[PDB]
Design an enzyme around this catalytic site. Structure first.
Site, PDB file in Angstrom:
ATOM      1  N   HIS E  73       0.806  -1.202   0.000  1.00 20.77           N
ATOM      2  CA  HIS E  73       0.000   0.000   0.000  1.00 20.77           C
ATOM      3  C   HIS E  73       0.846   1.262   0.000  1.00 20.77           C
ATOM      4  O   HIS E  73       0.291   2.362   0.069  1.00 20.77           O
ATOM      5  CB  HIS E  73      -0.955  -0.030   1.195  1.00 20.77           C
ATOM      6  CG  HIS E  73      -1.730  -1.303   1.277  1.00 20.77           C
ATOM      7  ND1 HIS E  73      -1.459  -2.280   2.212  1.00 20.77           N
ATOM      8  CD2 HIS E  73      -2.727  -1.786   0.500  1.00 20.77           C
ATOM      9  CE1 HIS E  73      -2.276  -3.302   2.016  1.00 20.77           C
ATOM     10  NE2 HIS E  73      -3.058  -3.024   0.989  1.00 20.77           N
TER      11      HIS E  73
HETATM   12  C1  HEC Z   1     -13.774 -12.584  -8.132  1.00 15.94           C
HETATM   13  C2  HEC Z   1     -14.928 -11.822  -8.401  1.00 15.94           C
HETATM   14  C3  HEC Z   1     -13.011 -12.037  -6.874  1.00 15.94           C
HETATM   15  C4  HEC Z   1     -13.516 -12.059  -5.603  1.00 15.94           C
HETATM   16  C5  HEC Z   1     -14.911 -12.603  -5.209  1.00 15.94           C
HETATM   17  C6  HEC Z   1     -12.509 -11.487  -4.769  1.00 15.94           C
HETATM   18  N1  HEC Z   1     -11.407 -11.113  -5.473  1.00 15.94           N
HETATM   19 FE1  HEC Z   1      -9.749 -10.300  -4.701  1.00 15.94          FE
HETATM   20  N2  HEC Z   1      -8.010  -9.703  -3.904  1.00 15.94           N
HETATM   21  C7  HEC Z   1      -6.834  -9.553  -4.598  1.00 15.94           C
HETATM   22  C8  HEC Z   1      -5.815  -9.141  -3.690  1.00 15.94           C
HETATM   23  C9  HEC Z   1      -4.339  -8.840  -4.045  1.00 15.94           C
HETATM   24  C10 HEC Z   1      -6.329  -9.056  -2.484  1.00 15.94           C
HETATM   25  C11 HEC Z   1      -5.628  -8.627  -1.203  1.00 15.94           C
HETATM   26  C12 HEC Z   1      -5.391  -7.128  -1.146  1.00 15.94           C
HETATM   27  C13 HEC Z   1      -5.116  -6.543   0.197  1.00 15.94           C
HETATM   28  O1  HEC Z   1      -6.111  -6.652   0.963  1.00 15.94           O
HETATM   29  O2  HEC Z   1      -4.262  -5.623   0.226  1.00 15.94           O
HETATM   30  C14 HEC Z   1      -7.736  -9.412  -2.594  1.00 15.94           C
HETATM   31  C15 HEC Z   1      -8.642  -9.444  -1.570  1.00 15.94           C
HETATM   32  C16 HEC Z   1      -9.901  -9.984  -1.690  1.00 15.94           C
HETATM   33  C17 HEC Z   1     -10.810 -10.210  -0.603  1.00 15.94           C
HETATM   34  C18 HEC Z   1     -10.448  -9.904   0.854  1.00 15.94           C
HETATM   35  C19 HEC Z   1     -10.585  -8.444   1.304  1.00 15.94           C
HETATM   36  C20 HEC Z   1     -10.115  -8.348   2.733  1.00 15.94           C
HETATM   37  O3  HEC Z   1     -10.551  -7.366   3.377  1.00 15.94           O
HETATM   38  O4  HEC Z   1      -9.081  -9.023   2.969  1.00 15.94           O
HETATM   39  C21 HEC Z   1     -11.924 -10.735  -1.106  1.00 15.94           C
HETATM   40  C22 HEC Z   1     -13.201 -11.168  -0.357  1.00 15.94           C
HETATM   41  C23 HEC Z   1     -11.750 -10.838  -2.528  1.00 15.94           C
HETATM   42  N3  HEC Z   1     -10.507 -10.365  -2.864  1.00 15.94           N
HETATM   43  C24 HEC Z   1     -12.672 -11.330  -3.413  1.00 15.94           C
HETATM   44  C25 HEC Z   1      -6.688  -9.720  -5.938  1.00 15.94           C
HETATM   45  C26 HEC Z   1      -7.636 -10.136  -6.818  1.00 15.94           C
HETATM   46  C27 HEC Z   1      -7.361 -10.311  -8.177  1.00 15.94           C
HETATM   47  C28 HEC Z   1      -5.917  -9.979  -8.722  1.00 15.94           C
HETATM   48  C29 HEC Z   1      -5.884  -9.325  -9.914  1.00 15.94           C
HETATM   49  C30 HEC Z   1      -8.502 -10.752  -8.762  1.00 15.94           C
HETATM   50  C31 HEC Z   1      -8.703 -11.094 -10.247  1.00 15.94           C
HETATM   51  C32 HEC Z   1      -9.497 -10.823  -7.674  1.00 15.94           C
HETATM   52  N4  HEC Z   1      -8.931 -10.423  -6.501  1.00 15.94           N
HETATM   53  C33 HEC Z   1     -10.813 -11.226  -7.829  1.00 15.94           C
HETATM   54  C34 HEC Z   1     -11.681 -11.449  -6.764  1.00 15.94           C
HETATM   55  S1  FES Z   2       1.664  -0.666   3.105  1.00 11.84           S
HETATM   56 FE1  FES Z   2      -0.041  -1.828   3.907  1.00 11.84          FE
HETATM   57  S2  FES Z   2       0.905  -3.707   4.594  1.00 11.84           S
HETATM   58 FE2  FES Z   2       2.604  -2.386   4.111  1.00 11.84          FE
END
Ligand code: HEC
Ligand code: FES
Ligand SMILES: CCCCCCCCCCCCCCCCCC(=O)OC[C@H](COP(=O)([O-])OCC(O)COP(=O)([O-])OC[C@@H](COC(=O)CCCCCCCCCCCCCCCCC)OC(=O)CCCCCCCCCCCCCCCCC)OC(=O)CCCCCCCCCCCCCCCCC
Ligand SMILES: CCCCCCCCCCCCCCCCCC(=O)OC[C@H](COP(=O)([O-])OCC(O)COP(=O)([O-])OC[C@@H](COC(=O)CCCCCCCCCCCCCCCCC)OC(=O)CCCCCCCCCCCCCCCCC)OC(=O)CCCCCCCCCCCCCCCCC
Ligand SMILES: CCCCCCCCCCCCCCCCCC(=O)OC[C@H](COP(=O)([O-])OCC(O)COP(=O)([O-])OC[C@@H](COC(=O)CCCCCCCCCCCCCCCCC)OC(=O)CCCCCCCCCCCCCCCCC)OC(=O)CCCCCCCCCCCCCCCCC
Ligand SMILES: CCCCCCCC/C=C\CCCCCCCC(=O)OC[C@H](COP(=O)(O)OCCN)OC(=O)CCCCCCC/C=C\CCCCCCCC
Ligand code: HEM
Ligand code: HEM
Ligand code: HEM
Ligand code: HEM
Ligand SMILES: COC1=C(OC)C(=O)C(CC=C(C)C)=C(C)C1=O
Ligand SMILES: COC1=C(OC)C(=O)C(CC=C(C)C)=C(C)C1=O
Ligand SMILES: COC1=C(OC)C(=O)C(CC=C(C)C)=C(C)C1=O
Lengths: 159, 194, 354, 92, 108, 48, 354, 92
Positions: E73
């Protein structure tokens, strides 16, 4: 060139030694280490390579993990999304005999169903320099709140 | 400061006492998960056999699983081979470890979506809200490359690119594929998976 | 034992003027047995190796396993509701003035219950339980080396679970034994009535009080069945379904609702030990609230204004605990703690004569 | 521990009918949510004025400090509550 | 160490001087701490490499201060491990560690 | 297990360091090879 | 309970003419408590997901873990030795003729012990244990589908270990309760003496019988300490330290020494169920050996020739069990079974008059 | 469960002295056990005659069936018991 530990090099020599002996006994051909290469001593080079590996390095035993010199890439997530779209549409097009297999990249998006995801990757790459100075700050908790009970306090055993 | 914004209360069918999980929506949800979410997330605790005679017929689940390649072994020579999937295999995982996954998402780890429908306050509503909660950053907030604003993620800045775009997939049943539909459907499916 | 049963169930005489607040104890005993049985059955399909996957394997693979999982979690909430309501009753009717021995036996069970519950949530191998035992173990961090002995390592690990699990398996059976000591004093030291005096209005238990006690328990069952199958009330935090990552701290490290009165105390007071100590005061001072009195009266059936303000103090502190550690909630919560002490002093102080 | 809280169906206002999403001039279906955004923003005008005010106050500051996330999160939560009440009526 | 990444960095005189310069601007930092109170020996910085925002592991020689940049972040830490920019709220924690001799540390 | 019981600590380090073990993953999610340490089990000739 | 203790320990009168064979029971009670305590403590460090690797981790990493591991294994051997010797005594002095209620209570504990020991062996998760249960479970293979309900799979897996472990944890506590029922009948139905009649020679227990009972227990402790630390006698088969391999069958699938009598019975009889049934006969017929008699006598303090041949029959059958299934041993062992039936008929049959 | 059974040292006849292994003409130490083989075979002559008899009886059989493992295992067990009583006296 040579591994800090010569275990790899020795294993190569032994593998050569074992294979040559097995061949010689199976085919009843001459086996003579340390002699002429043509009829024997097919493992001469590997043996010398291990001896060369004996140069070794200072305290090779003291291995230290390190973080990668290169950080995670700039727009890998956007690129991965575009790749998934290209593959999914290719799979659907071959299955349903569509012309979407052709014109996989399309300027208008009329011929490309993955144009939009591609555009996002291009924009992120383009704005990498533009947003290089971006703070990435919204509302940040002050330290006093962050270290209060229910937040980051007593979080490591033995606190 | 305050806790992350509470998700709205969506009127899903299954919320009533005498109501079930809408199988038609769960089926579409599997398609959304397989074609969008799966690229980065894994459902380790969801197996193909869980969908047999519940979401899809047995033969169909075989075809879905067989589409993937898994690493099984060892063989008689002590080596690992690759086979098509079966009804006893877990859903495929995009990355081999958490460190590989983190290296492909700017250090962020895509969480496993097996229990995510109940791992956040709001439950299923949190998934629907999050996927439809991307917005232009608030004034005064500037986000680096790969950081996107979302009103329901804690903090506001999520490393997940906005995943749902109109026309991303074509539903087999013909339902119009719009961002809000995919959200409603993948939220339904993940709730069932939990 | 049949004669014992007949003496304590069939020919046991109780006053006919008791309310339905005298049925709470029967419910505790029944719901307690249910929690032991369900616990032993769950353990048949899960152990300590990896609870996160084990709970998943119970709810998805075991036939009717979901029933066992949700009963054991929800019936805990129920145990703590009925117990806490049983105390509120005993305070209102001041059933500690002449039956202190019964009160002492009950408090022992309360202490045991407070340890049984805390440790059950670490058996689930969830994030909010991992980081909530890491934060309560570090309160005895002053006693040298004691944390290491309890934990079994320098950080919470499977080693910590393998040992707490044995305490969670065995301590409930001891609680059942103390329940006998409790029912022993109740039967010898006759129960208190809705009236302050003692009256010849007693009726046998099996033919009357047990029929009424079952009407009560079946009423609660109707409500508990609705929660058990439809989650009408959120009684379990969702963040316990997040796999343990020792690097990331949960959004909020809060206990379950039935430890939020002592979690707030610990988050409000500015010194860690002062908090620990005020949590001892809460569970200990209430055992001497009639000891310093000198009048021939049990202070019973008055307006109970002090009682009402105490019951609300408990509820209000539970609210502050849910809230994040914002400064304004901390200031207001410190006033609520000061107020509790004054209310407690009012119970304790004997009265001078005009 | 669970995704949702159960309620009587009379407390769960599920869409009684389905209105198909509008079709664009191109022929691609338009997202029902995008069409509902302006209408729900008007219903949350009071919070939007607060946010718009913040934007102009931070615009004046000659230093680089100042954010309006707090007021945006209140507007967004309001706009989204409005959307939840009517969005599933356009979704299958 | 105990399940967590523990960054151990030898610091060049430039790195040490940089943190010493911010040692005067303390109280202008989110979490005011002086480099002297975060390092036992100036040449050696031992810190736990866990971003104080959401736990991601920062990468060294990255950011605006050439310290440690968490790419998740966008949190930037200085050559002493103090948060200087980003979402992160606090400074990277200093583990319990002593110096056995001049060329050996003991973590724990 | 052999330190201060069969061999001195430094000697056991040399013995363990003679072997190569497979540890990881690294930050890039890859497995690497390191010299052995006092906390490693005795090397195994075959993978399965 | 203090008055109860005083009535049953301090003012309990016992005949002064009893031998040291009347101390065996005290030893069982003490060694039983030790087996429960050590079991619970071992559980603090054991992972039932792999008990082969778990036992290694106890003996190598836990401080003084080797003591716990070897005490729990060797004290089992000791429990069975003392119990089996307690039965031999009761048969010699025919202490079942007038104190059948005591005999019945004891047999219940014997049945429970036979289940506890077997399942504890399987928790070791070694070759012998795995194949042994796989052989026993296949004796109830006739009852349709019951093997699947007990095993939890089509072959023994950790699923079976996780459920039998709960029976091994809980069944010992119930045994301790039956021990109270046993000591209850002993104290009401006075103990038998070395003489057939009843005599006014009783002395209090704490001041005399407990001092003598401790001299006995300390004598056994000296011997048990030598076995515990030096393995003077091989009481544990070595093939339980071989990692389980479902493909290879062990050299010999035998139980612990204290199950060899019934193992032989099952390996000698030509029909599987006949063998199971003759094991039932052994543990059931001995409960009615005085029921058909009609004379005013307890058949006590005679030469006990029938008794001696029975005790030797037990020892000889244990020998045949160790031996591989050589045909010669099977024929000889079938004669020993026929002889046992005849000796047991001799005890049962009432006598006619000349 | 354990490798050995404990005994009093007076029951454990441990070598009281050490006789170094003989050295060969080449200079390589000769195995003490190999030197003890003939002497211990003589001590087990009775079993060796039984084995040798079997060998000649199986040699006559005109079919290919016949083994003398049973008698060899008895001879070997005997020769080895003899070796155990005196081998560790030549080993450090
Ligand atoms: C298909 C529609 C989906 C669904 C249902 C979700 N994602 Fe993602 N997601 C990605 C990354 C890197 C993260 C972590 C980021 C971080 O929190 O800094 C996430 C996180 C989620 C969550 C959790 C949120 C929480 O508060 O932790 C959920 C429920 C979720 N996703 C659902 C990355 C990606 C992708 C990368 C390109 C793709 C494609 C998706 N997510 C797709 C989905
Ligand atoms: S900037 Fe969010 S985990 Fe490090
Ligand atoms: C405010 C009131 C506060 C006082 C409450 C009573 C206290 C008391 O003395 O009771 C103790 C009670 C003994 O009472 P008692 O007088 O001896 O008689 C007992 C019965 O006789 C025993 O009788 P029984 O033996 O027959 O057993 C049956 C009994 C079993 O239950 C009990 O024993 C009951 C115990 C007390 C319960 C009190 C519940 C009060 C609920 C009020 C709800 C208001 C809703 C308003 C909604 C508005 C919406 C706009 O059930 C009842 O008696 C039920 C009676 C009715 C309950 C209330 C019903 C309210 C209906 C409102 C309808 C409104 C319609 C509007 C329509 C408009 C249309 C336009 O027991 C105890 O001492 C402890 C009991 C455990 C709970 C104690 C809780 C104390 C704290 C209360 C906090 C309330 C919330 C917070 C308020 C402050 C916020 C800042
Ligand atoms: C991780 C968690 C850990 C938790 C651990 C929790 C531990 C809890 C321990 C609780 C212990 C409670 C003990 C209660 C004893 C009550 C005795 C009784 O009925 O006294 C009535 C007695 C009545 O008063 P009194 O008439 O003046 O005294 C009459 C008696 O003659 C007065 O007695 P006396 O002068 O004749 O004898 C004094 C003393 C003298 O005792 C001795 O000299 C014998 C000591 C033997 C020690 C054990 C040796 C074990 C060897 C094991 C070897 C290795 C095995 C593997 O013997 C006794 O007190 C009776 C001991 C009976 C032991 C039976 C079991 C043995 C095993 O006293 C009372 O009621 C007042 C005191 C009550 C207790 C405070
Ligand atoms: C260069 C190095 C040199 C080193 C030299 C070292 C020399 C050391 C010498 C030590 C000598 C100690 C002598 C002590 C005399 C004082 C005895 C006394 O005060 O007793 C009263 C005192 C009890 O007082 P009390 O109750 O008033 O009177 C007891 C009786 O009423 C009184 O009647 P009693 O006379 O029959 O009492 C004798 C004993 C007798 O106790 C026993 O024997 C108990 C075991 C019974 C089974 C016996 C099987 C016999 C097998 C014989 C095999 C023979 C092989 C012959 C080979 C010949 C080859 C040529 O009684 C007890 O100890 C009672 C124990 C109670 C145990 C409680 C549990 C009973 C369970 C039920 C019975 C057992 C059932 C299973 C077994 C069934 C077998 C079919 O007894 C004890 O506590 C004494 C314990 C010690 C016993 C003697 C130990 C002798 C050890 C000799 C070691 C030699 C080492 C040489 C090394 C050389 C290296 C080069
Ligand atoms: C008191 C009620 C407690 C709650 C009972 C409950 O959950 O009932 C489930 C269900 C409600 O389902 P909804 O999804 O809200 O359906 C709305 C219309 N389709 O209730 C019903 O089916 C009807 C109400 C229960 C009737 C019970 C009749 C039998 C008992 C009679 C006792 C005399
Ligand atoms: C495991 C929890 C407990 C159970 C099983 C339980 C059980 C019971 C039972 C069955 C009764 C008699 C029936 C009744 O009048 O309701 C009762 C009475 C009583 N209990 Fe408890 N109780 C528990 C907790 C407590 C606690 C924590 C206290 C003290 C704060 C307590 C104090 C009392 C008192 C004073 C009485 C007598 C009430 C009167 O005078 O009739 N109990 N309990
Ligand atoms: C006073 C009685 C008891 C109470 C108050 C108590 C409390 C609870 C709690 C709160 C949980 C956490 C549930 C969840 O994960 O959210 C738990 C878990 C557990 N308990 Fe108990 N318990 C009791 C007795 C027992 C008994 C006697 C056993 C049987 C040995 C048992 C076995 C278990 C097991 C295996 C778990 C882990 C599985 C789970 O998460 O559901 N409990 N307990
Ligand atoms: C009548 C009492 C008991 C007897 C006869 C009995 C018997 C045994 C046996 C024979 C073993 C196998 C030891 C070995 O692997 O060779 C065993 C294992 C075990 N028992 Fe018990 N047991 C008793 C009660 C208990 C109790 C109350 C517990 C505690 C819950 C317990 C816990 C264990 C554990 C954890 C093991 C596996 C570790 C081991 O192999 O040593 N046992 N038991
Ligand atoms: C867990 C195993 C058991 C324990 C704890 C135990 C305990 C005891 C105790 C303490 C005594 C009184 C002291 C004595 O005279 O030695 C006794 C007596 C007796 N027991 Fe047991 N016992 C057990 C097993 C058995 C079994 C399996 C039987 C039946 C085959 C049995 C039958 C008897 C009889 C008949 C007596 C009375 C002896 C006489 O008349 O004095 N016991 N036992
Ligand atoms: C996570 O679990 C728990 C806590 O976490 C913060 C608590 O505060 C508490 C309260 C602790 C004390 C010392 C009063 C308990 C009991 C609990 O279960
Ligand atoms: C001191 O012990 C406690 C009680 O008993 C007096 C409570 O009533 C309460 C409050 C209970 C309810 C149902 C609000 C709690 C939580 C408590 O900690
Ligand atoms: C492994 O083999 C075993 C036997 O073999 C047939 C037994 O007889 C027995 C004894 C069985 C009974 C019913 C007394 C046991 C426990 C055993 O483990």
């Amino acid at each position: 060139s040579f591994t800090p530990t010569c275990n790899k090099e020795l294993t190569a020599h032994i593998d050569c030694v074992k294979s040559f002996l097995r061949e010689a006994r199976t085919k009843h051909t001459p086996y003579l280490p340390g002699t002429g290469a043509a009829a024997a001593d097919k493992c001469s080079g590997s043996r010398e390579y291990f001896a060369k590996c004996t140069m070794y390095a200072a305290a090779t035993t003291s291995f230290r993990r390190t973080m990668s010199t290169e950080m995670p890439q700039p727009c890998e997530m956007e690129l991965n999304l575009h790749g998934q779209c290209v593959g999914n549409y290719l799979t659907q097009s071959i299955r349903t005999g569509k012309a979407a297999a052709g014109a996989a990249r399309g300027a208008a998006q009329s011929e490309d169903k993955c144009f939009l995801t591609r555009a996002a990757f291009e924009k992120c790459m383009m704005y990498q320099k533009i947003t290089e100075r971006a703070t990435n700050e919204g509302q940040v908790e002050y330290a006093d709140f962050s270290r209060r009970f229910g937040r980051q306090t007593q979080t490591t055993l033995g606190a | 400061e305050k806790d992350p914004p509470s998700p709205p209360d969506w009127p899903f069918w299954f919320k009533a006492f005498s109501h079930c999980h809408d199988i038609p929506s769960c089926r579409r949800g599997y398609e959304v998960y397989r074609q969008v979410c799966a690229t980065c997330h894994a459902a380790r605790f969801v197996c193909f056999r869980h969908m047999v005679n519940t979401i899809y017929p047995e033969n169909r689940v075989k075809q879905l699983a067989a589409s993937f390649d898994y690493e099984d072994g060892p063989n008689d020579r002590g080596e690992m081979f690759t086979r098509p999937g079966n009804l006893l295999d877990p859903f495929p995982s995009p990355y081999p470890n958490e460190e590989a996954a983190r290296f492909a998402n700017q250090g962020a780890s895509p969480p496993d979506l097996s229990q995510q429908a109940a791992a956040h306050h709001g439950g299923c509503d949190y998934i629907m809200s999050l996927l439809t909660g991307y917005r232009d950053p608030p004034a005064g907030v500037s986000l680096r490359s790969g950081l996107y604003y979302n009103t329901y993620f804690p903090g506001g800045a999520i490393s997940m690119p906005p995943p749902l775009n109109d026309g991303a997939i074509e539903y087999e049943d013909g339902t119009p594929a719009v961002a809000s539909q995919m959200a409603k459907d993948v939220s339904q499916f993940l709730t069932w998976a939990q | 034992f049949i004669l014992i049963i007949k003496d304590n169930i069939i020919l046991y005489n109780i006053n006919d003027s008791i309310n339905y607040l005298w049925n709470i104890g029967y419910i505790i005993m029944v719901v307690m047995i249910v929690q032991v049985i369900t616990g032993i059955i769950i353990n048949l399909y899960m152990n300590i190796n990896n609870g996160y996957k084990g709970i998943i394997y119970i709810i998805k693979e075991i036939y009717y396993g979901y029933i066992l999982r949700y009963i054991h979690n929800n019936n805990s909430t129920l145990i703590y509701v009925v117990v806490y309501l049983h105390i509120i009753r005993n305070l209102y009717y001041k059933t500690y003035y002449y039956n202190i021995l019964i009160w002492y036996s009950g408090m022992i069970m309360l202490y045991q219950l407070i340890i049984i519950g805390f440790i059950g949530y670490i058996l689930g191998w969830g994030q909010l339980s991992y980081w909530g035992i890491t934060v309560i173990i570090n309160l005895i961090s002053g006693i040298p080396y004691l944390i290491l002995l309890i934990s079994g390592n320098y950080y919470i690990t499977i080693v910590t679970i393998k040992r707490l699990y044995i305490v969670h398996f065995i301590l409930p059976i001891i609680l059942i034994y103390v329940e006998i000591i409790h029912v022993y004093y109740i039967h010898y030291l006759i129960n208190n009535n809705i009236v302050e005096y003692n009256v010849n209005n007693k009726i046998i238990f099996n033919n009357y009080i047990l029929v009424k006690d079952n009407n009560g328990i079946i009423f609660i069952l109707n409500i508990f069945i609705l929660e058990l199958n439809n989650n009408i009330f959120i009684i379990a935090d969702n963040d316990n379904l997040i796999e343990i990552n020792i690097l990331v701290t949960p959004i909020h490290i809060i206990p379950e609702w039935y430890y939020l009165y002592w979690y707030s105390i610990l988050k409000l007071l500015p010194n860690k030990y002062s908090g620990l100590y005020i949590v001892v005061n809460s569970i200990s001072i209430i055992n001497i609230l009639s000891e310093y009195k000198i009048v021939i009266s049990e202070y019973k059936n008055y307006k109970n204004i002090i009682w009402y303000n105490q019951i609300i103090q408990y509820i209000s502190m539970i609210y502050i605990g849910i809230q994040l550690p914002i400064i304004e909630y901390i200031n207001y919560g410190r006033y609520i703690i000061i107020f509790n002490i004054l209310l407690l002093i009012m119970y304790l102080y004997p009265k001078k004569k005009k | 521990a669970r995704a949702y809280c159960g309620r009587f169906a009379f407390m769960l206002d599920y869409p009684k009918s389905y209105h198909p999403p509008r079709k664009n001039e191109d022929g691609d279906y338009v997202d029902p949510r995008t069409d509902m955004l302006p209408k729900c923003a008007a219903e949350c005008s009071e919070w939007l004025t607060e946010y718009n005010a913040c934007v102009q106050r931070i615009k004046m500051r000659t230093d680089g400090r100042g954010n309006c996330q707090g007021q945006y999160e209140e507007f967004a939560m309001c706009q989204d509550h409005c959307i939840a009440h009517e969005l599933f009526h356009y979704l299958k | 160490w105990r399940g967590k990444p523990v960054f151990v960095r030898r610091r060049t005189q430039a790195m040490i001087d940089a943190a010493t310069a911010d040692d005067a601007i303390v109280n202008s930092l989110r979490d005011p701490e002086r480099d002297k109170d975060r390092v036992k020996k100036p040449e050696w910085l031992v810190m736990l490499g866990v971003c104080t925002h959401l736990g991601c592991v920062p990468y060294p020689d990255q950011g605006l201060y050439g310290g440690y940049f968490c790419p998740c972040h966008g949190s930037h830490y200085d050559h002493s491990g103090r948060i200087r920019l980003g979402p992160a709220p606090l400074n990277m924690e200093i583990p319990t560690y002593e110096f056995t001799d001049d060329d050996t540390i003991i973590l724990g």
